[PDB]
Write an enzyme that holds these catalytic residues in place. Sequence first.
Site, short mmCIF file in Angstrom:
data_model
loop_
_atom_site.label_atom_id
_atom_site.label_comp_id
_atom_site.label_asym_id
_atom_site.label_seq_id
_atom_site.Cartn_x
_atom_site.Cartn_y
_atom_site.Cartn_z
N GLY B 25 0.82 -1.19 0.00
CA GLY B 25 0.00 0.00 0.00
C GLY B 25 0.86 1.25 0.00
N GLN B 27 1.55 2.82 2.63
CA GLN B 27 2.44 2.66 3.77
C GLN B 27 3.50 1.59 3.50
OE1 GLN B 27 0.11 2.03 7.33
NE2 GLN B 27 -1.53 3.37 6.59
N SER B 51 -0.83 -4.79 -8.05
CA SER B 51 0.12 -4.15 -7.15
C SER B 51 1.34 -5.02 -6.85
CB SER B 51 -0.57 -3.74 -5.85
OG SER B 51 -1.56 -4.67 -5.46
N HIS B 106 0.26 -0.74 13.45
CA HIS B 106 -0.92 -0.59 14.29
C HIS B 106 -1.06 -1.86 15.12
CE1 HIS B 106 -4.60 0.81 15.89
NE2 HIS B 106 -5.41 0.13 15.11
MG LIG Z 1 -7.05 3.82 13.38
#
Ligand SMILES: [Mg+2]
Lengths: 313, 313
Positions: B25, B27, B51, B106
């Site tokens: 992506g 990121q 991709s 994350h």
């Molecule tokens: Mg979030």
Amino acid sequence: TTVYYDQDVKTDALQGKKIAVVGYGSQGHAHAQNLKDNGYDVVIGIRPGRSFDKAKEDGFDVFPVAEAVKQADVIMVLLPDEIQGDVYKNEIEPNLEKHNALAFAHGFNIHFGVIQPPADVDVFLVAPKGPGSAVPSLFGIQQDASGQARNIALSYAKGIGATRAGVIETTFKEETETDLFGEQAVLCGGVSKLIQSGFETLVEAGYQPELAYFEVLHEMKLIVDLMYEGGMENVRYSISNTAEFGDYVSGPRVITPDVKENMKAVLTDIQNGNFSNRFIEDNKNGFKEFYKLREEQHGHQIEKVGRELREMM
Amino acid sequence: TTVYYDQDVKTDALQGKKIAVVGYGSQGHAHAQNLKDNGYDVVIGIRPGRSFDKAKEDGFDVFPVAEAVKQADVIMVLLPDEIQGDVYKNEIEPNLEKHNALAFAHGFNIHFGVIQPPADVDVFLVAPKGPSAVPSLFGIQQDASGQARNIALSYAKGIGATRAGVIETTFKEETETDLFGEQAVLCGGVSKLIQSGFETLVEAGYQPELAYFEVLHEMKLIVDLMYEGGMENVRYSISNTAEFGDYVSGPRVITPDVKENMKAVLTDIQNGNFSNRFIEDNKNGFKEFYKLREEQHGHQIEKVGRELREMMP
Ligand SMILES: [Mg+2]
Ligand SMILES: Cc1nc2[nH]c(=O)n(O)c(=O)c2s1
Ligand SMILES: Cc1nc2[nH]c(=O)n(O)c(=O)c2s1
Ligand SMILES: [Mg+2]
Ligand SMILES: [Mg+2]
Ligand SMILES: [Mg+2]
């Protein structure tokens, strides 16, 4: 919905007349310089001080306010709302003439009756929006005495460049009450405690105040910038599915329907006049309630955490 | 309250280690070429698709996820929270070796038990906040090799997250503060607050265009001032009337009950209720998710924004 553009304004009702921009703030310098750029004889009437001086160094002719309105044919009052009442009685009204314009960018003192203009003078409003990279502006009319109040207001909005993105007609009541509501319920008052109560929730839960400061405040600029460019649907698109999902199911949980009832309650006191006279009578008492509320806000933990993060090392 | 920069990472642990970034992506590409430009062996791991060779045509030698994880020692997963659980169990975990390093930007899948890593692998987190310069986050779930913090901090500079600073946190704190910020303030809280403010003005008889300006369009100026000089800069730059309304009506709109509604949202994020609710809808085809996003698209606020932004250069 009546929108006037640059090509919609046909005549130059402003040329041949002299313009008095009362005050030299951020908006006063914007209006005054945009008129001289289009070949308009613009004059500035302000009290001596640091903004009196700044207007002098920008090539402007600065005078006392009682003489600038004597000199000009359209007076744009851009002073703070709390001081416009006495400045009008002691410096503007005694030097008024006939068949020329008393302009404003906000209709607080007019719609709330603080400033009562005579019959033989045009009183209109022109409120620029956004950068004050063009956003539609607003304009309105309270009195038409010269028979050209519409073309004077529209050619003045064209002089300051407010008609490049189009000017929308409104009333002094609509502009005043929608501007006051947005500040109290959403933009300023509504969001700030929304950010405060969110910050207090995370800090009271044992989270680091720095990480809490990013998640409820510093990260909002990106969300707001997306909404500014492509609307709310742009925010829902750019944020992750987890964030978009949380928006949908937890948004109504935080902003319950009772919060909407509170917004209509504060709007009622804006319409009847409970807010206006409260802000005015506190001003006549040395802004005691105002200053106390301003100073107490500085005691919040979120403001100290913010400046410590900005003074990084 | 302590922050780490490029001057605090005295020793580089990533030297001589093949790093695989699962996904490509915006990121995944930012990490992949940042470390490659700073002298690190990186390899893309992604399924075949448009991709896949997109990463190959950008100067990377890209393998499937299973083989990229095998030949690498530090595996960084930069894919949406809905997909991380599946490709980890089917492609990452079987090819995971001892004393490897599992990385994330994350901590959703780790903190909520969707991804349960082995005990002999290192698990850390590096969460940027820029994509200006703002501090980033980092944390360590497990320390098997004894160097999990050294690998995490040197990886923070590999992507270029050190120069503005890196603040320490845990997966629990990073995930819950990020989820609460979106659900209580950033997206859920603000947009619902703007909707209720917009509905209040249109139901009162005001023009929807002026109602769209004063509850949404003017917010970018306010949030920009809060981003630059904190909340104190907002009250300093706005007019006294807007500042006075901020103090006297903010607590009226956001009552103490609004605060304890955010504690309920934070509670549902802590006990894992929101997480598996989001996973439950994803495993059902996002049926309630797409129903909710179409309801928001039907709000009067969005169409008014579309017709208002088209007249803006
Ligand atoms: Mg979030
Ligand atoms: C453009 C952006 N989309 C997202 N989605 C998220 O979930 N978090 O947490 C974020 O910070 C951002 S920023
Ligand atoms: C920077 C800004 N300060 C103020 N003060 C106000 O009263 N209104 O209405 C505004 O729109 C703005 S924008
Ligand atoms: Mg305004
Ligand atoms: Mg985030
Ligand atoms: Mg205002």
